[PDB]
Each structure stands twice: as structure tokens, then as C-alpha cells.
Design a binder for this molecule. Structure first.
Ligand code: ZN
Ligand code: ZN
Ligand code: ZN
Ligand code: ZN
Ligand code: ZN
Ligand code: ZN
Lengths: 232, 230, 232, 230, 230, 232
């Protein structure tokens, strides 16, 4: 039928950092969300690709994500390439996502911007019939950006107060990334990173009058219907 | 008991220009919307206070607005004054609006910014029990700005595609403002102004994938719940 | 002698959407303007490349454009490539345009930003003698951006009130793009798009005290001489 | 009959810093430019009202400005007051300027923003017939801001390459301001200030491909006609 | 003789929220920091002027602040008034601060912007000899803004990793503000506010590679000398 | 041991224009700074590559720069390429710079933005152990941008009042670039350019209360410790 949400990350844990709470919130309401990791994060200082993929599976189940893909594009190699756009178009056209999410570009990790750029190009081409005509076109309704590193004034927020614990659980599934363990090394991700993610969501929460909120960017104004006065 | 929306303008027609479509959309759904105009637009180039008051009633009727107030503050005199803030605080506390709207400040007409500034101060003070303790306090949930003159990248939009006709009717209620008539003088408001308002809403509409949308500003991030996936 | 204006678009109709009114205004005053379409818009949902080229010719004549080129670069393929910059440099050096226009980058169609980026690179290289020394260098005086999709606060406007009908005519020349016809499909361009373009120009018009104005972006402050107090 | 340009400053030398070059350029072409300083700069660290008034006359002469007014509002007292707005409205309606200039608000000296704010309110009210109905209204065509302290990405520039010398002469007319002399104290204005003003204009110049340019801000998009292709 | 830092707030706890960590960091190094609260927060939902004054003393003690003043201006009455500017000018000239801090204007509480605006006007006038000539003038070196409500991309940060505990202690001194207690009502300040303040500082910290950092705004570019390479 | 500062430019003279005063200020204090020019500026209208390299050496000695490298990437060819990132990573890992500087992207010369983009990518990859594992990783502490063409509100300034003459000397070392001579041609660099650079620094100086200051951009807030209240 088609995914309600397809969220792209450069590396498994990107989507979790940006929007694990939102995903958990909406999968619980019965919406179908998929995650597509562009790379296997082979250059990550800690862990292995297989371990990372296993953690991605654990995280997916925590978030109620039934569909998780890895396009196996090179870590630190998300250049603006036709072949990569093609691969993402294939994903978009296969899963027909109503909404697509990708990282926000203003991020210390260039892969995140590069992922967003590829996804943006792919979203546009996905709706073009004559492009890759072997697959039926799909028009994504909206493209939004979640935040990985740092913070920005969000265009919109999703209240994740009831789902923060699940987000932390989803994040903690990436043991290799955010914890040293027995043979791991100290990285920015190991040293108070998950705490920083919680902090951001607390900060965004306060902005909108809730305990924890995830913040999102949108190139277009968000369309309000039921959320203006509530009632759903 | 309280209004769902209270929309402030400096002059009658302000709220209409900014959000007649949204107001009509929501009153049709059974929501209670009030309008409070800060002034009687005593200095308007065309028309009189008399004619404007009647037009404001016609516009309110068109929009399904049952409550329209005018604070009769001086046109072009919306200075940051305690007396004016307290009058607006009285209004907010009386009508207990969930949402308050006011003009966006980036506007060629200084009254519009001045109105927004007064309303913002009043919203904050309205929630403060110790302030004007004779009148029970009220906490407004959200404060949004609509656009009168010009345009800005909206923080959010309301699809008014079905209500554009009603918006135009509500605007046209101000015949003294938007038409020269036979005795009136040419103003920015008579020279393709209503057409410009429709044009803006068309532009905002296209941006969000609808025919016509009204654009709004919000200092805080918009909180989505049902509107993310509909 | 050299073009007064060379306007680039990614697709034929880009320049029209952004600045058909301005072009018509200035060709009528006897200025020479050319248009260079980077692609043949082969991936356009409606029409054919030949039909599109014929519509581009009709549009050009409506606007009083005597020079129209198509570089036949791939639709959805305006990557930052040396070969493409080279081709545009060749165009700039051949036609010696005083002003160059291209799409503004803040646009839902990535080709538009990509076109602008290529043109910007080419403009700079066009003025470098040692670059492609087989063609004499040319220094473009100013590079401005017109708007295709959406809207932005313009850095400057051109009053096109007297030329709006001609702009609409130029736009309507692209029957395949903005009208369904007998065998066309519904796209964002077919559903109230031309009306939206008029709306934008009405909006920009009001900003500057005229009926219809086209809005432009400029990286540098515009230099005023005669337009400060008028009189020409 | 009306001025082509009326330039407001908070203090005499403001307009010179912002736009002496532009003023000189246009007065030489036969355009009528007036300057109105809101205050007599009564609190200036160096000089006196007496000396400053004379310097302002010398500067006006250098710039070819035939009309210079001073409203003698309080230095550091340019509050948003009705009385001050109406005094400025009187000036605008008397001199009927096509263009009005005032300082840009993003400036370390609060009087400059305060001046601009007052002037903006006055420009709007100047066009309103019912406001101060004893004096015929005037509609200003465009309102632009010049820069005094610091710098900003200009919305537009005026090539003043031929008039930099005149600008420097006009600035140097304020010897009490830009030089310590023999009894004066060190201020931001004495410590390489004129050199900084020239520096800015050099920077703006380079940006637009000329030797020296003055930079201006405009809330509305600049309307080009002849200057697109020259 | 003069203070190194004078930090202004509209209400006691403002300075703490913005910069208790920085203040503690620098007082521990032997720098003299003063705090001036413009109002006694007479309209605060919870507590009394009495309790708040005592809490402000406890907070000052925690931060190593030896000088705390209160100007007892009206809560929610921080209008741009000459009388208020001059009171603040008196404070600046008396205590001769090298640096002055005030709230950042982009803040849901209008008093915070209003405080900053008053302080900015006062800083400028404090340096003007002819203004209030009975009291020797003082030139403040730099004016910075700290953040109370919300967050902004800071122009600069101060590493407060070692002083977060002291900041929390200083905030917790305002038990009447940040806890409902047993008789108090729920406010934005009682609902995970201190946790939000810590959260912000964690966020700013991460941005600059430390555990906790306080963020500051500066209208002028930050001048680096020793901190470029440490 | 490792450089305190490594400054990248696209062309020799870039670093000088942006930060010759700062470099001179800090080399005089005994800090070690290196410069890496990405290209030999082979497309420069005046001079030759060898002459340019000789001027770069003269400029380096004026600034007290003991290390100057040229990566010999193509002028007007600083595309986002893996090979170029690799080369810069090698430089960063070899010289272990505490701070890295590159041009600010908002610049009429696209090479400057392109240089900054390459350097940003390289800085990130330089800290990744598994990337190019033959060289030990290096974490650059901070990345800042200097300004070449035009001007921007600086995030921070360095007082160069005492070192302006040295900056002018460093700039004047590029005789081929900023002076016509006997067989040179008129370019934007020859016509009041060095004067414009001084002007900018005078402008930035006034902003921070000094005679001359260089202005820098930083993606992160600058961390103040000693510079808040002085004393070092
Ligand atoms: Zn990642
Ligand atoms: Zn109005
Ligand atoms: Zn196109
Ligand atoms: Zn002044
Ligand atoms: Zn407060
Ligand atoms: Zn260069």
C-alpha cells in the first residue's frame, strides 16, 4: 500500500537521533514507517558493519519500524552521484512514502547534509514518470528534516514526552556507538552524546510547552488543519 | 465558555486581510471566533467611523464571527502604553481565547506592528494573576501573527481554498476601503489591493499544495500531532 | 556586438516564468536579449523535446528574443561538471552578455539551483583569459537570479505592469506544460501554475507600488544611478 | 516645489556620514536636497551646540544642501512620542520630499535607530489627510536608510567615486567631532572614524565595481528601470 | 575599583538562568561581579517580594556575587522611560563595570527584552559626560546578552562544566519559583524549567566540545586574543 | 609536534588576504603556522606558476610561516572529489593542526567556497581512524573561515593593528597579482584591491574598538575563557 513515513539516514542511528520518539509515537498509532540507511557506516571508529546492522534491527523493533533498508553506499562517500539518486528513487518508488525524512544539512558531519541532498534530488526524480520508467513514479507529499548533531530553531515539533524512554532505548541499542564497552574508543558519540540528544528534546519540549519534543525542519510552511485548535 | 480564537487588528479589515478565510473555515466547524479592533480607524483616507463600524459588522457576519469589539484607541496612536495594555488584558481575560492572533510586525503600516506589540504584552500580562487582580487571569495557549501588507515566508499555513470566496466577500464588505467609489480618493487599498490579497493566498496555497492558503507566523515552533499524517 | 541580457534556464519556460515580462519590456526598448536553455527538458511529463523546442521558439518571438539556444544537457542531470561549465563559458564568451540571469537556487526543482550553480561557475571562468584561451574572455557585468517556483523577498523588482499580458502569452506558448489538452496529464504546472506566477508578480507589484513586478535576486547590492530619483 | 531628498539624522554629521557623497552627487545634478537633524547634539562629548550649528552649515554648503533644519529635540531623548512624530510630520508636509532618508537602526548609537523609528512613523502619518488636518498631507515615495556606525550588506549602493573628496570635506567640517583638537577628549569619533567611513565606502565600492559607494537599506525591493542596463 | 561584570536582569533569577555558571567561574578567579535586578518581580505567580529578596541573596552568595542591587521598577512595567534609563545610568556610573550583561531580547517574557533595551540605552548614556553631569561618566567596554527563556545560536560560549552544580544551586535558591511547593501554582518555571536550563547548557556545551557551556549574544564581533590558541 | 594553525587557500595570496595579520601576530608569539595552497593558480591573468610560488615563499617569510605547501590541484577545478579530500586529509594528518582556516564560502570567486568545502570534508575525515588507516587520525580543534573577497559580519575578530604593515608587505609580495608592472593586465586585483583589504580591516577594527582587525567566521560559537575579561 505504501509507507506513511520513510526516514533516511546516512548511518544507522541517524534516524534514531533525529526522530526515534516521533517514529515510536506514530508506529504505536498504527502508521507504517520505514528507515533507509544510506551507508553501513563502515568508517565508524567502534563496532563492525554486521554489529551495526544488528543494532539497527534492534533499534527498528524498539521503534516499531517493520521496514529497514541499507543501500550500502560508502560511508564518507555520499557524493552527488546519479547512481546514488537512482538507488534512492528506487526505494521511494517501491515504498511509496507519504512523508520522507532526512538529516538537516546544518550538521558537523558532512554525510548528513550529503544524505539530505541525495534524498532531495531522489524525491524530485521519484515523481518524474519519464525518469526510470521501469518503476511507476511516486509523489512524496512532504519532505522534512530531522536533527542529528547540534540544534536549530525547529520549524515544527512533535511532542515525544510519552516516547522519550523508547527513543533512549532505540539509541541505547547502538551499544557500539554510544558506549565504550570492553574494546571501544572514546568518540564524541561516546562522551555524553545521548544525554545531549535528550537535552535538545527537553529544550525543544519547553519551547512548545511539553516535556520532550523532537524538532524538524521544512522548506515549505507546515499545513495546519486539526493541530491549530486540536481535537484531531 | 471562552473563545477559541481572538483576532486583534489595529483597524477593522486587518483581521479580514490576514485571516478571514481561516476564521470562516473554523466558525463553519462550530468554533467561536472573536475579533477585537484596537481603533476605529478614525484617520482612514476613505470612509468614516460610522461607515467602518457598519462594514465591520457586515464582515463579521460574513465570517461567522459573533463577537466583534472595538477598543477605540487612537488610530496612529498605538503607543506602548500601560493603559492600552490593560484594556487589551481586560479583553483577553473576559473572552478567554485559546488562540490569539495579531498582525505581523514586518508591515509598512506601523499600527500593525504596534498592535502586535501591544497584544503580545497583553497576552503575557493576561496570564499573571497579580496583574490587575480584580479580573481573573487567563493563559492564552498560542499567539500567532497573520499578514496584512506584503508577504513573508509563513511559519504555517491554513488551507482556505473552500473559503476564498467568503474571504473576498468579507474584504468587499469594506467598500469604503477597497474601492474609490464616487467621492473617495486613491489609496494603496483602492489600487488592486484585494486582488493582491488573493494573489498572496494563491502564492501561499501553491507553496503548500492547495489553491489558496493563509500564512501565519509563530515565534515558537508549530506543534504537530494530527496534521503530520492527517 | 554582444547581448544586453543572456538568461539561462534549466528547461524552456524557466526564463519565461522568471522574467518574460522584463525581457519583453527591454526588447521593446531595443535591447538584445538571448535565452539559453541548458536542457531540452526530456523528462517533462507532457509533450516532446521537439514540441518543447517549438514552443520555446514561439515564446522567444513573443518576448522579442532573437537568440535562443539549447545546450542539450540532460534534464535532471545538471551536475557540477567541467564539461557543462565549458559549454556555458563558450556561450557567454560568444554572446558577450552585459547581464546574465539564471534561476534562484531556493526552488523545489533542483535543476534550477543546479543551473544557477553551473552558470555562476561559467560566468567566473568566462572572464579568465587563460581558461579556454581559444575563445576571448568576457566579463559579465552583473549576474541576477529570477524566480521560478515559489517566492522570496526580491532584492530588486522590474515593473512589468504593461508587459504582463505578453508574459502570459509567452507562458501560454508552452501549451504542453501548463495545459492538459487532449492527451496530457495533471502536474503542478497544469494546475493553476500560470495563475500563481501572475499572483506572485501582483504581490511583488504591490510591494513596489505597481500593478505587476518581477522580482530578482542579486548577490551584490544593486547600483542605483537614474532610478533613485527617476528621469532615466 | 518639494525637495527631491529630505535626509534626517539624529545629530548633525549623521547624514554626512551616511550619504554626503550621494547628496553631493545629486545636488550637483540640480536636485534639491534638505537635511533635518532631530537634535542639536547637546550631549556630544566634544564641541558645543554653537560650534555644531556652524559646522552643520559649513557641511550643508559643501554638500550643496540649501535647506538645513534642526528640530532641537533632546539628544538621547528621541523617544517614540506623538509630539516628536508631529514635528517631523510638519517637516515632511512642508518640504514635500520625494525621498526620505534616515539612519539604519542596526547601529551602536540608539539615537540613530530612534531617529529612524520616529521618521518612519512620521512618513506614514504625513500622508494621512485626517492626521493633523490643518496641514496639507504629503506622500513620500520611498524611505531609505543610510549607515552611520558600522556596516551592513547594503540593499543598494550609490557610486560616489567622484564625490568622496566632497564627502570627506563635509565630514571634516565637523572638526569638533572627528578631531580631539587641543582641548577635546578622545571619542569613537576622534579615533580613525572618518578613515573608517572612507573604508566602508571603499568596501561598498568594490562590491559594486566602483572606487567608492555609499550603501543604503530599503524595506521594499528596489525598483529598477534605467539602472538595469544603464 | 569598578566591577568586572555587572549583570542586569528584569527579575531576580534572570541573571542566574542566563549566567550563574559564568558568574561563579569568574568570581572564583577573584573577579568582582555585581547583579542588578530592575524589579522585585512583584507580579510573580509564586512567592512574595520578601521571599524573592531573600532567595536573591542566597543565590548571590552561591555565585560569589558580593554586590546585588534591586531598582524596584515595576514588574511588567519596564517601559522605555527616561526615569528608568537614568536610574540604570546611576548604577553603571557608580559601579563602573567593564562588562555589562542583560537578557537577550528574543524571549517569551517581554520584560527580558525590555530590560535589555533599557540597559542598552543606559550603557550608551552612562559614557556621555554631559548626560547627568552631576555623576562622573563611565564607559562600559562590552555589552553581552545572556539567555533566559528558550535558546539561540550563541555568538560565544563560556565553559561552565565545573560550575554547573553551582549554577543549579543558585537556581534552586529560588525554590518559590522553580517548585510548586505545597501552596504554589503550576507555572512554566515549575514544570521542568531548571532541567531545561541544564539541558540548554548541555547543548551549548556539546557545540563547543565541553560538558556544559553558557551561551551569549554580542552585537559586535567577539574579539579574540588569548582564546584563539589558548 | 604539530602546527598551531594550518591555513588553506585555493590560490597563493588567499590566506594572506584573509589573515596575514593574524598569522604574523601569532608567529611572532612563537606559534607555528603553515599554509597550504590547493592550486598553483595557473589561470591567474598575471604572472606564472613559478613566479607565484616564489611570491608565496616571500609572503610566507614575511608572515613568519615556516611551512608552505601547494597541493597542485587545478585552478578552477576544485570539484568535490575523493582524491582531493584524500590529499588534504594527508596534509591535516601530517601537520596535526590545532586550528584550520579556509576561505569563507560567500565569495565571488567560486574556488574559495570550493576550497572551504573540500577542507571541511577533509577535516572531518582526518579524524576518522578507519579512513586512510595508513596515516594516524587527527582531530582538528576548530575550523574557522577567513574572508577574501567582500565582507561579512565577522563572528570573531583578531586585532591586527600592530601587524597591518606586515599584512600589506605579505600582500605586496604578490607583485604579479596586485600590480601591473611592465607586462601585466588590469584585473579586479590590480585596481585598488589591497586598499580594499585594508579598508575592510579598518572597518572590522572600528567594530571591535581597534585600528585594524581581521574578521573570521565560525560555524560553532567561539569559546571564551581569557578574552572575556582579558589578562590572557
Ligand atoms: Zn550519522
Ligand atoms: Zn490596518
Ligand atoms: Zn524548470
Ligand atoms: Zn549621530
Ligand atoms: Zn525574568
Ligand atoms: Zn583566491
Amino acid at each position: 500500500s505504501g509507507l506513511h513515513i520513510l526516514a533516511f539516514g546516512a548511518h544507522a542511528d541517524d534516524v534514531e537521533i533525529g526522530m526515534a520518539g516521533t517514529i515510536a509515537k506514530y508506529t504505536k498509532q498504527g502508521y507504517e514507517v520505514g528507515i533507509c540507511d544510506l551507508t553501513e557506516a563502515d568508517l565508524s571508529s567502534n563496532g563492525t558493519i554486521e554489529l551495526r546492522k544488528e543494532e539497527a534491527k534492534v533499534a527498528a523493533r524498539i521503534m516499531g519500524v517493520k521496514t529497514r533498508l541499507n543501500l550500502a553506499m560508502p560511508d564518507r562517500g555520499l557524493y552527488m552521484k546519479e547512481e546514488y539518486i537512482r538507488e534512492i528513487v528506487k526505494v521511494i518508488r517501491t515504498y511509496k512514502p507519504k512523508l520522507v525524512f532526512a538529516p538537516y544539512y546544518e550538521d558537523r558531519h558532512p554525510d548528513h547534509a550529503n544524505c539530505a541532498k541525495l534524498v532531495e534530488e531522489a524525491i524530485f526524480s521519484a515523481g518524474i514518470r519519464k525518469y526510470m520508467p521501469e518503476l511507476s513514479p511516486h509523489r512524496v507529499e512532504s519532505f522534512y528534516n530531522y536533527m542529528i548533531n547540534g540544534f536549530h530553531k525547529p520549524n515544527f515539533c512533535i511532542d515525544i514526552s510519552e516516547y522519550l524512554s523508547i527513543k533512549v532505548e532505540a539509541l541505547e541499542a547502538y551499544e557500539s556507538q554510544f558506549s565504550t564497552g570492553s574494546d571501544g574508543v572514546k568518540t564524541p558519540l561516546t562522551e555524553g552524546y545521548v544525554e545531549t540528544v535528550i537535552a535538545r528534546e527537553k529544550m525543544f519540549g519547553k519551547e512548545v510547552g511539553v516535556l520532550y519534543a523532537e524538532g524538524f525542519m521544512s522548506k515549505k510552511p507546515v499545513l495546519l488543519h486539526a493541530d491549530l485548535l486540536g481535537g484531531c
